[PDB]
Design a protein around this ligand. Structure first.
Ligand SMILES: Cc1cn([C@H]2C[C@H](OP(=O)(O)O)[C@@H](COP(=O)(O)O)O2)c(=O)[nH]c1=O
Ligand SMILES: [Ca+2]
Length: 135
């Protein structure tokens, strides 16, 4: 996998944001995780949703460098959102949320699963430490 620079346009919620990639604005959705809903009426404002959103926002807003890393399978989902592992100053946002108990490992679609085990070990840690979602 190769990391590529991007520029933050707007953080939307815990796992979706708009970035300027390859000269064009695109909304991105973090690979392999799921932060709680704060938008969709069918799900309503789920618990920790606002929190996951605050965590992500702070993280990407205060970063000097943002990089996107596509996996080896498809690069966009059915809604046209880019699918990637996002890094804020070298720290993977996907992992950070999981480790904090603000996201669950989900939507594991082969072959876009290169970092699955890494994210799972962090989630098991958040779980045993009964953090947020796991409390
Ligand atoms: C992370 C991810 C999301 N999705 C889809 C599944 C879900 O679609 P449905 O709308 O059909 O449930 C939705 C989950 O993202 P959200 O958490 O943003 O809803 O996006 C994929 O298609 N593949 C992925 O790798
Ligand atoms: Ca979500």
């Amino acid at each position: 996998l190769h990391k590529e620079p991007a520029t933050l346009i707007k953080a939307i919620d815990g796992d979706t944001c708009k970035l300027m990639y390859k000269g064009q604005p695109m909304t991105f959705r973090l690979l392999l995780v799921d932060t709680p809903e704060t938008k969709h009426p069918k799900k309503g404002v789920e618990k920790y949703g606002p929190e996951a959103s605050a965590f992500t926002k702070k993280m990407v807003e205060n970063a000097k460098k943002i990089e996107v890393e596509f996996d080896k399978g498809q690069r966009t989902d059915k809604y046209g959102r880019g699918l990637a592992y996002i890094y804020a100053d070298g720290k993977m946002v996907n992992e950070a949320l999981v480790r904090q108990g603000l996201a669950k490992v989900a939507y594991v679609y082969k072959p876009n699963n290169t970092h699955e085990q890494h994210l799972r070990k962090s989630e098991a840690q958040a779980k045993k430490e009964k953090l947020n979602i796991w409390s």
